Symmetry: D2
Subunit: 116 residues, 4 copies
């Protein structure tokens, strides 16, 4: 699975379950073209994002819907969302895990890039 998104909850100290996540790919004309969509699972993971789809070289945007998540939990968050924009597969095929750690007024995002 070459694109994996994992989200944790730093207030509850757990997986962030059912977070909307939309991946996009910057097309040849400089506009973001949908690429994959998802809701995180019981373990805060979102798998098979390139099933049926080519994971080609390019610029990707993983957009995590943190506002909905915190609002569904009765909290008013600071951010509308958490976006992670990066170039994929520029030096060859890689496997990517984007981890997001969440609080209402704060997030962190790391990328684990491993060579297949």
């Amino acid at each position: 699975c070459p694109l994996m998104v994992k989200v944790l909850d730093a207030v509850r100290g757990s997986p962030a379950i059912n977070v909307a996540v939309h991946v996009f790919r910057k097309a040849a004309d400089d506009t973001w073209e949908p690429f994959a969509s998802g809701k995180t699972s019981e373990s805060g993971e979102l798998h098979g994002l390139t099933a049926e789809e080519e994971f080609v070289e390019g610029i990707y945007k993983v957009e995590i819907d943190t506002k909905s998540y915190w609002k569904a939990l009765g909290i008013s968050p600071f951010h509308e969302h958490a976006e992670v924009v990066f170039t994929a597969n520029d030096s060859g095929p890689r496997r990517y895990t984007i981890a997001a750690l969440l609080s209402p007024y704060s997030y962190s995002t790391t990328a684990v890039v491993t060579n297949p």
Copy 2:
């Protein structure tokens, strides 16, 4: 100063100097209009950012050019930038600090909202 941006470098243990930062307010036709812009100083800070009487209520995106910053030092970072998107001044004026802490493959962002 009602909107400050502050940047640290987690690798070197110091402020992040000369980091380009571009702020945009979302326009009603639902697109991002230039709002202000600048470079962090010697203390990693950016002040006097709000273009005249313009810091109205609205959706803001602060974009930090972290890629140029790591590339100026010879490092090859994960991200193209770090965008922070938030609604500002919807329930009466506050002062906003956007703190960003930077690593080549990771960053962290926090809003410290305080009351006039």
Copy 3:
């Protein structure tokens, strides 16, 4: 696995490999008693630390030898190490993942605690 430790390297974007980890449980007399120990694997993980029914209620301290890790890559770090001290299982025994993300001048730690 009821006590697990994940370390990640935020400079390189990968698991932190071969990092020395030492757990301790606080004793009857309020001193720290050697409990388990390990070095993180290829995936930056350290497994079979506790042994389920060997994991009592108490205060544990996970220490991560972050200093050697950075000096073994030719970097000179800030911290001597990173410690994590938590109360374990004071309730209906649960699984603990302690995740640590590393950088020379900074680290961040998170607990994922799940009902088995």
Copy 4:
């Protein structure tokens, strides 16, 4: 001020005010000897922790009472405290800021080592 200590709350998005910080130095015999101590202020900062005519080369430990901070707010946190341990002024004179960013189940810490 050769040793500042700044604490932010990532849940509420404000400084963490009134936080108990206790600082130790490792003595000749390798036991932690009390050194300075205090409580963070309206800005979450803790100034006047030490005097440059007294802050000598050695290993310090900066312990921050996150548990009482979270309880005082009705929150059952994960960690007992946040311990930051580090060697100081071994290369001569420098200013140190320990920044800590708190969530009930996570925290991150960065050292900003700047020069006289």
